[PDB]
Amino acid sequence: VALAIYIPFPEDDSNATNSNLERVEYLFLIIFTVEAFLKVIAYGNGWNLLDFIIVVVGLFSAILEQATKDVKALRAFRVLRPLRLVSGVPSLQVVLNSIIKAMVPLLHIALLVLFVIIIYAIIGLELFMGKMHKTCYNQEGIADVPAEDDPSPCALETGHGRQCQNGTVCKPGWDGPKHGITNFDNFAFAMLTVFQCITMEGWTDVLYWVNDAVGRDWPWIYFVTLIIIGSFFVLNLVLGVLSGEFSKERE
Amino acid sequence: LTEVQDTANKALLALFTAEMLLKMYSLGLQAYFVSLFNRFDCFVVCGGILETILVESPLGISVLRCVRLLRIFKITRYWNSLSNLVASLLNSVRSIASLLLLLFLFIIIFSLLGMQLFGGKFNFDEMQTRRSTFDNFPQSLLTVFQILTGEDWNSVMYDGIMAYGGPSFPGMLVCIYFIILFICGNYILLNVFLAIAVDNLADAES
Amino acid sequence: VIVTTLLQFMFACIGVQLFKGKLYTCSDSSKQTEAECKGNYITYKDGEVDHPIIQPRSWENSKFDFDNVLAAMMALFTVSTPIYNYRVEISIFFIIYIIIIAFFMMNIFVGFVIVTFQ
Amino acid sequence: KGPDVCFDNNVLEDYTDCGGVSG
Amino acid sequence: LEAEKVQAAHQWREDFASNEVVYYNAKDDEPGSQRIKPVFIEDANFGRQISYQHAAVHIPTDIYEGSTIVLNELNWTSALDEVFKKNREEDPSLLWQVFGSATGLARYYPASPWVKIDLYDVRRRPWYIQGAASPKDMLILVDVSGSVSGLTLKLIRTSVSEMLETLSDDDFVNVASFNSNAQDVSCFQHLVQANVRNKKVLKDAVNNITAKGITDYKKGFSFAFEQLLNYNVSRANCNKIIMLFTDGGEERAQEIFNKYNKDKKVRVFTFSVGQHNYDRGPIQWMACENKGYYYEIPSIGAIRINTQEYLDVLGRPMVLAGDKAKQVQWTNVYLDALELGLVITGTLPVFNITGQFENKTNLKNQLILGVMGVDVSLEDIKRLTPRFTLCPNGYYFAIDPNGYVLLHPNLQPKPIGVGIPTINSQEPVTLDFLDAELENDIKVEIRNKMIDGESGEKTFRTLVKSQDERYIDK
Amino acid sequence: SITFFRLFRVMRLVKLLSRGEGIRTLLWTFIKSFQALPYVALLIVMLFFIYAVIGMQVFGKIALNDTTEINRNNNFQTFPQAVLLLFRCATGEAWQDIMLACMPGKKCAPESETPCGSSFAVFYFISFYMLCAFLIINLFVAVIMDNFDYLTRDW
């Protein structure tokens, strides 16, 4: 309830409380260290490793920054402290073992979602990569993508893709379909695009951009498949694996 | 209309009271309070008394009247299902208490990370109002839920992946987060649901 | 289908009692009374101080108008099919119809199915 | 050379009408 | 005098449908308000079509006719047409007579149709402001801390740039900023005359500020009070006010207010800018303890109105003066909104004196109903100085008590420049005497001796420039 | 074309799946049951087919305007494109807006030569979404149930 107050701010402005919560983080970082060392004296396992790393990173980060006056990351670890809520209280720790022990069978399914994604990303960069960079770029004058706002890959007067009308002209440029993050250009963007794509969250849109760029005859086969072999088929296995496990428990 | 509604409630409320009151003597006081439904009935009649003595804020009155929708289902229309569903509902909700707890812990953890990680980095200088923004924990929770629901979760990815930095190299290690939330959260969510089904409906239906 | 239908009825009969008359508003944010909202105002396209636009003021009820049980009824279908003036609250209301809906749409159905397994 | 007239600091002024004293 | 008498006798009524009001709207080609169709006969002196039968009314596009306020203001401002005309027959050479009401509507005579987007507002014009309050010594405090970054920063920059347009050359201004450290935004470091040039520097410097750091109201206010106690430089020796442009906070800074103004000679006006959820409690406290007001600016639409409403607070001591505050003041030369050339405008504020005979109202009577105005074209003045009896090298010229020429052969009906134009009537034509012609040392003492209202003759040799700007003669 | 003969290489990677018993068996099993789902598959294709001919005949000539949702990439003018639009709706991709685009008042296409876009739309799309969801839950349940031995075994 201390990490849920500090309002995170523009630039560096701070209210009295924030600094005053950085103050009590200097109490939470003298209690957690005396606890740590007093318990070390006893023994010197697993869950306790979370305690150790949280403390290490902690005191560290602070003292480091102590004189420094960019924690962010260095202080974005303390959000792992609420894991000790699970660790200490044994009421939901058993629920966590049940959850973990139910996912063990469906690791073959996590080794296959990955294979489908990889095969698709690789196939994809091979056919559609680098073709999404044009866009109706003007009004026979001099400026930027005019196409209303939505710019959508356009295709020169020879590629059967979208053809641009009016006094617009297709020409290279346009970083991308959508800030460049929804393109098969490069491999990583490709794997990610395929992934966002199989989750059935805008699969039609990627398809339309691709349809615009390379013509409509063969882009679609690749997506219909990705979806049918990627979501419906893959979706069933998890249910099948999970349900079978429940029944064992029910039994 | 307003006249009529008031006039009706005034008498309709007296009605339920006398009835419940007489039903008290015939039945065994103890067993009467025993049946969950009867008990809830008593509770909400008390609600009417409370609202009346109050009239002796509009929002509060409306809330109390929302409470009085008990009788609405008192008739237990189609109890064949109504009863089972409500009974099951109590059983079901009770059954997955701890799983729901874990889900909430996970959500809170992520929301805090969200505000730490992307909080403050969403000023893209556009009057555009972003419903999803890790500005504060309340909104943080909202953003996380939208991502979990996938309403505009891919869009929220862009915010971070275009915030910390452009669509470049170190500016994408922000995405490795919006996924860990869409697989893990959704995984836990599905686990929690199924339980409802396979582990109750059946026990109940059999 | 009928279970969900009746629920959406009762849930929204709750809405009417709680949100009636709290969505009506005017184009000019400055104005806060229906009477005040009469005439024309100025809007700067994309916050362009140099882009004045003389729009006309009007008092309009927002979407999901719980003006009567009915509209709430259809909106409830709409969720299946302002920003924080009072929205945050409505938000949670538009999350429960869900929970409850599914909760039993599944319950009655998947459990209904098993006989298929028998 | 500035104006020779100056009108401020009157004791009889209401002093009680701000923009937040009411709301 | 006929505006205070008629307004006092006015009875506030809220029903207008059964008894309509009749008037001519300036910008036109409605139940509760009848409209007049004038004849619009063409007439000289003016350069347009005018009607001498009634007075026109201009209502801003944002304000709405029909409001109980506007409609109420349209009856008690109807006996003005009788005195508007009575002025005309006595002096047929009378130019525009205007009553700029505090509601926002201006009623001027003779009636003439209004001249793309009509942004005219009678409460922002230079002739209105100079008659609505005494000169001021405003210092603008801008919060450039971290939390104001984003939309609220572009609202602050516009707000500061929009209130600097409410200052004439008789007022002295300076803009500071605090971000846990207080400094000026420009090369000034003290109060400046706030003329056309100095305001441009402040506007340019304000547009280049960046929001980053920690807010600190004590250091910001110590700088604000220190700059108001210079007395080494030229100042107005008048209304000392402070404008604080922030969003919200939790600091009251009561020690600073207890150290610098115990007797409260400095008004503090606080503006809460932008849409946020920070505490506005302390912001309202500084506006009430110090003799100020609290304003809120949540969007671009509210920037314009909220930046001229600080003048009705400054007019409170002027109202209580009585008949001693009714002196006609003349503005600098400027271009008329209704195109008539270069004109100067007389001014006279009108007070709310309802219940004056009963002697106990003192509720809204501390505010002014509006500001009167009559225009004098520079052509009328030039007709009083015959020239052809002189040689073509001699001429008359008169200047303000600021150095600005009221009439000069060099003063042209064109706005003055302030810099190089770039592409990606509102301002007075303030040309100094030393810039109208060549500058000599003897002509500086001549200029100073004319500001002091002295009378003397001097003969000497000087450098004159030909009509075309190519030669120099002695 | 040349490209097709190129993709080939990548495929080989699949052979790396013909390895671990754990992955081999699961797929083989469900694949060995993706034939005993006939009646809940012919039924689905039947649905698509019928709704499509119907659709192509009523909501067909609605003119195409890129600014709207019945654009050249999601029209209703060739059996194939209509089946693609129906697959979108089934995949739950903003089916709503497609529906609104099919209400009366839309102008008839130039080749068609606003008397277009019958109101049946609501019934169509909503009926479709519903029927589709069902038939699909039937599919999943069918498959798993049929294969409920592997899905639960004391190895």
Added chain:
Amino acid sequence: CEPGAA
């Protein structure tokens, strides 16, 4: 004067 450029 003729406008510049920016």
